């Protein structure tokens, strides 16, 4: 028998080789590095438990681990969302700096301990798109009354803008959109969103998804199961999560440019959210966080840590990074690349 | 497995040198000490700029280096590391891991007895350290500048007199005045190396290295001698160490740039005219190189194809979000 056989419940549908596939990547890293002695068996959303309930099964010990986004559990405690994403937080590179070198992994694990979980980053999507709409969104008034599928704590922010948020796992969004039980949806980005098929119903694809600037997709491990590993397997697990985390982001970065082109070729209309909309959403988020920080000490501790770095990050990003990337985009648009 | 690793980098830099220690620790811990890589800093086993030569020659089993140091052997060595006006860190990594880049570079490196995997990235580099402001292309005429890699050839077209010097040995050359100016990496590393004391004008961006990969290069015989299990573990650990280095730069640089400015560093953007002239010079160099060097053409054409796609997509969600956040930062709203 293998030294260790674990089951992993995914929050994600098997169609998505990006976000669901990250668990398969981890599994292969581990079995290959151990000649098959460390086996993580991977199950798509709904196979063992509903996708939005994956972490609950980990806490209960019904599965040894899951691959999920922490913000799905905002209803239990909004603190769950912070190391995944909340609106107007860090970019992928920013949050990863914080995770791996700013004490972020330990801060989140200190919170998660009481929930019988030890977690490590297990992917990032980069800046998300702004979702799929049947009509133009030019003002915040245009958002009022929209039944929109939204992930995580962004639902609470959306509520203050007059949106009616709905909670739906990835693979079950499309039928609700097609049948008209939701008006609009966000998911992730061009590759995934094209695969899920929204563009055949809703033709307006907005950007940016200010709700998720750089969301981490955690591997969450049952605390007992993790602590029962040898130090050798524990270290290998952390190394492999670190690699799989990067791998998912890199896969999105490879696939998204091709998928955006496909969506546009098929007639999809890309549109920016106006600066006014973004400001209104920022102000709504600020109010929600102010209330949450005051009433929830665990939330305040982690959010204050993220914000402290966030200001420094967006100061430095304006120097080499912004100027280089802007120059290259200008060259691209001028036909010079 | 008992290997030695020759680093191109000075031991003071826990970022770029430190990446080798990170890999060694990942491997030792994952194997209870059975896969051991002894790490040596620049100049310990071989000079920093010659690390890969030691691997080709089989004198050491591996190195941690930047491929562009070997541009004089073949400019193709530079492409999967960085050449001017290439991909960002996220862009080059998409290409390495999902665009066939790792295999393409390894197809080139096979004849040189090397198997390589990405082993770090610095993100967009800074524009170097100068004793006085440079506002025009004419201003850089005749400047003796330390610059890494194939950027030297591009710099020569602008009248710069380039040379490569390993990290650790740049500062004394700058202090003595044997070089007028230097580039290295970015605020954290450059502050440690101390250039601001001599040459306080710090330009940006370092258009020569938008997202340079720092490779682990393994002797082909040594790599092929590993069990498939250890080969896979090695690739997984390199993948994690590659991410880790970029993440450490991203954490440390924001603090270091503020420290440098507090210590008297004068941040200056390169003028649009300088950037355009450097771009046109690089374009000329690459067109010539593609015609004379089939190996270079093969890899550069692959990177170029993706570069166009990347810098189209990056204009959409990413640019709009990150620029909004920068505007909020500047307005005091964060
Ligand atoms: Na989302
Ligand atoms: Na450099």
Numbering used by the authors:
A (entry chain B): 29 to 365
B (entry chain A): 32 to 365
Please give the exact wording used by the authors of the publication that reports this structure.
In Rhodobacter sphaeroides, TakP (previously named SmoM) is an ESR from a TRAP transporter and binds α-keto acids in vitro. In this paper, we present the high resolution structures of TakP in its unliganded form and complexed with sodium-pyruvate. This study reveals a key role for an ion in the attachment mode of the substrate, as well as an unexpected dimerization largely mediated by a helix swapping. Thus, and despite very low sequence similarity, the TakP fold is characteristic of a type II ESR.
The structure of the selenomethionine-labeled protein in its native form was first solved by the MAD method and then refined to 2.0 Å resolution with an R-factor of 17.9% (Rfree = 20.5%). In the second crystal form obtained with the substrate-bound protein, the asymmetric unit contains one dimer with both monomers now found in the closed configuration. In the complex structure, the acidic moiety of the pyruvate is involved in a salt bridge with Arg177 and one oxygen atom is H-bonded to Tyr100. This cation has a bi-pyramidal coordination with a square base. The four equatorial positions are provided by the O3 of pyruvate, the main chain carbonyl oxygen of Trp215 and a bi-dentate and mono-dentate ligand provided by the side chains of Glu214 and Glu240, respectively. The apical positions are occupied on one side by an oxygen atom from the acidic moiety of pyruvate and, on the other side, by the Oδ1 of the side chain of Gln156. Since only sodium salts were present in our crystallization conditions this cation can be safely identified as a sodium ion. Among the six residues involved in the recognition of sodium-pyruvate, only one (Tyr100) is provided by domain I, while the others belong to domain II or to the hinge.
